[PDB]
Every structure is written in C-alpha cells, then in structure tokens.
A = this chain, B = another copy of it.
Amino acid sequence: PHQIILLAHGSSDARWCETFEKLAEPTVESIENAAIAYMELAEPSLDTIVNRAKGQGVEQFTVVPLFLAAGRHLRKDVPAMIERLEAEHGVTIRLAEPIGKNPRLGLAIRDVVKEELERS
C-alpha cells in the first residue's frame, strides 16, 4: 500500500544517530511500517528503505523531513533526491514539508521551555 519515511541528516557520530532514533521512536512504534532513513553516512539510506518496501509491494511513499529548517542547498537537493529515487525505483514519493514548518513544533518548544523554567 503506502509507507511513511522520516528523513534525517545522518552522521558518523553514534550520539547523533541515537538522538534521532529516539526522536523517531514514538512514530515508529505507533505507525505501521513507518521508518527513519538517513540522507548520508548512517544506515538505513532512503534507497535501502525504498528497495525493501518495494520488494514488499509498496510503490507509494511520503517522506517527512526531520529538519527544523532547510537552507538553499537542502531546498534543491532533497527534491532532486526524491526525483532520482522515483525514477530509479519506479515509485511515487510525496515530499512533505520539514517538521520545523509545522506549528506543533513551536508549541512543543514552548512546553519544553516551561519545563526548563521549572528546573531553573
């Protein structure tokens, strides 16, 4: 049917990857077959997730970027990567906006701030 993929900047720093794995955990636990993938440096790549899903019958995807913001390079490169994946694997991928554009993140930040004030 359809699969949702959380796309993070990868890293060779194990601490970075562990932080993102925990960030993705509530989604991965809650939503059927949701997965995190990394643009570079860490496994799994988007290709890896897409190849595995396709083997299981999935040709429709939604990519949710786990980015607070996207600069000029990300704005060009992520959609180019999506087109490349679509063409290579013969699948359809909707690129959602980065999570940093969603008002829920601003609200979460306020909640975190309130927690930090209670500590301070």
Binding site for B on A (CB under 8 A): 2, 4, 6, 11, 13, 15-16, 19-20, 22-27, 30-31, 34, 60, 62, 64, 66-72, 75, 94, 96, 98-117, 119-120
Chain B residue numbers with a CB within 8 Å of A105 are: 23, 105, 108, 112
Tell me the complex Cα distance, A69–B12, Å.
13
The 18 listed contacts between A and B (C-beta, < 8 Å) are A11-B69, A11-B71, A15-B75, A19-B69, A19-B100, A23-B68, A23-B100, A23-B105, A26-B103, A27-B113, A31-B110, A34-B113, A68-B68, A96-B116, A102-B108, A104-B108, A104-B112, A105-B108
Min CB gap A68→B, angstroms: 6
